[PDB]
Amino acid sequence: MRKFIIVKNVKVDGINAKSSDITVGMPPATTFCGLGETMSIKTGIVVKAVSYGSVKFEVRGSRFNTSVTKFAWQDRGNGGKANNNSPIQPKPLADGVFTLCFEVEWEDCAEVLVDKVTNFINTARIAGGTIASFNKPFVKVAKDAEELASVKNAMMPCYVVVDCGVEVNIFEDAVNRKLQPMVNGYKKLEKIVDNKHMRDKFTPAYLATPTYTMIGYKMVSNVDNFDQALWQYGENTKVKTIGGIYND
Amino acid sequence: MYNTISITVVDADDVGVNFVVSKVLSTLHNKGIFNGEVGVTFPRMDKNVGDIITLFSKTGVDRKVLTSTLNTLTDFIHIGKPKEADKVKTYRKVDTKSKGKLIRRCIKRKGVSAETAESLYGNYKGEKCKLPYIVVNSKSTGQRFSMFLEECENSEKFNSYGLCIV
């Protein structure tokens, strides 16, 4: 039919809050889709889509400047310099509390699914952040669009992310539409020739640059079509919602 | 074998089944039956007894004195024919007393006095003496316990409602 598993109040400490060179804050949908796919690889459960919501969130630092992290020495040929503060790249970190909902292909009993999900989460991070504590995951199911609303409100309370597309461009839309940019995918700039230095020796490699959309945050309740708030991979190496652009 | 006869409560949804069941078992105990040779068993009990109250005995249940001792409730009651079977889940009542009761015995007897001695025993109370299977009746003393029915195997000695020991 349609099965989901919800994990509420995922306290995460130490998030890599830089999603791109011009976006620092809430981890983007690409991150949670990658998390769902990591779980798919590690457990075998097929993950159709994911929906995430912020319960608490704070970037470290002040209002207009993010915190610095103290870089520790790490590279060879630096012993003649390890007696002084290591030079330093920017790496804003954050701390938060999220609620997750994964749509899954499951035919078995709920206890097995929940235990496999918990045993995966115990080995994961979220956007690099250490997972400190999460509630017991629970399963729900929906046949018609009425039970989908119950699955939706089961995440309460949290602010989930809807995709409202780009009219002009990121900057003009931020100024005029009072919305928030978000990394939604990537654009391939050039193929990388040699995998001498890559995570794989075989997987195709490309230099890329992020592609964005314009998102909005809304209380899972006030969202009508829950599909409009479920993110998954897809066309043209982007990610998007099952229900498309948000306007009910 | 035994000698069993079942009273089933019917058409009492106006007044609730379990309330009738309690009234029936009460009227039984109050005057007459359960002379040590009768006991009670509920073949449809799941939570809060159920719809059927059977009586058993080895010396034949008087089917006709029933119908005239349950004469005040006979409109919510269907008394069955004397049927027979060898095997009867037998039950017994489970007591749980509050702490204030415990403390009065521990003052009057069990050597102690004053508050400092209350706090000695009043250290940790029952914390959570939850129970299951209720039937309610107000005793002759003047209180309203909530009887609890735990399944025991046959003691073959009963007093009033349930089993005992020897």
Added chain:
Amino acid sequence: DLLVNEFDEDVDVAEIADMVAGVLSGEGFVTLKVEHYMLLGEGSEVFPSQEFVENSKLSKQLFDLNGQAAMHDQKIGNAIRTIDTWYEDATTPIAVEPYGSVVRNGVAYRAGNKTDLFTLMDGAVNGKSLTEEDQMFVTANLIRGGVFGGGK
């Protein structure tokens, strides 16, 4: 009350180190839930993590999570991995660092003396023999994690 700069023997520290070494030596995980209680006195100053920000409004900013004083995960980490009592002229335990770096004071206790993580790792890989404590130092650097760069 426990002596910090000496790793004195204790049966409960060892009873927990049993499971911790069992997880580190193999696979799996183990989570300790830690509480600390300190009798400091009514109204005593506590010391949350200090923030490294360019903030003109404050001369000293303390780390906060929805207004509550807190300490950075990475500072607790730097505290835990302070176990290195094996550098030359060893005095007190320092944090596991590939160069024995204590930038805090302007010194590195493993700089240019054949005892840095990279010299010892090249040794271990290329057939050389390792002390028990050089093994411990290299594996503790692996436990620390890192992105060690330079080479080919």
Added chain:
Amino acid sequence: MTKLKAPAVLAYSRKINPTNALMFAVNWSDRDNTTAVMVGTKTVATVNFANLPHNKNTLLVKYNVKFVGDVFKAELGGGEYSNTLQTALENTDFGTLAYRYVYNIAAGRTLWRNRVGAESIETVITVNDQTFTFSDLLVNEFDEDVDVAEIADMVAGVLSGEGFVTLKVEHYMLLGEGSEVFPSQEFVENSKLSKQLFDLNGQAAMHDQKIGNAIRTIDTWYEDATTPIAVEPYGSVVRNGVAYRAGNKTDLFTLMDGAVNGKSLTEEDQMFVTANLIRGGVFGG
């Protein structure tokens, strides 16, 4: 030129009006020395109780019921829909409705928990200077009594036409000294906080709407019928978590719309719809 819907605020006023019931104690052979049953307050951690005195053995429940005619004249509904429904129901068997109402009154269903465990029960009804007595009637069936039909004749004359009539009802129940009596229950927010019983100047009593739910219990024309339920537009008995007229085209609104829009009604359906209009409520929107 075709359809006909119902007004948005189509509403009917209730036509069976019982007063609140007061609870007294008497002796079965001393019915003139009445004493009031007082509600009881005593503490735990604090709940209410209501008992008979230790020198009286019979509970006495007094109340009244006024039957009001013009049962088709709506309270806020308009003209066309309500008047054509009145025309479609003019051949309703009012005799049966009156009989079942007055019998529920006489059989003592309105006593609820107070009739359980009674040595003997006696209902005394005054109406139009005529006194009727009923003894140990059966509740679960509509037994034939000449006095019940004699009173239901006046009641059906009122319901099928105009005016009103007042049945002044007393109930005597032989229960035994110190017995527990059962007033209406009030609101309880959580299980541990205070329980409360309904009173009037401290005297135990029963809500008028409870007696009303008792008198209204006549519906036996629901699918797979059995015992008589109270007249509700959906036949809802929330105590059983079901609605025996829900989603099977046997509800009040479907039958009403049918009666107004040409369709025909059985005698059972007509009696049900008229019993609803006598119950009252808003049947629109």
Added chain:
RNA sequence: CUUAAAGAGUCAACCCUUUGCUUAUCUUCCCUAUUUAAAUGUUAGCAGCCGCAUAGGCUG
């Protein structure tokens, strides 16, 4: 298969002196709150005895 993988912000601190918020004031007119009702959760518990008593068992 998460802009993956990695990281100590740390020491110290006198914010000090002084002060008139003053005058005046129309919140007015009109009003249908209505139909209807089971608190259920049978309540859910405890008073006395034996007891070395927070072992177990028993009284209407």
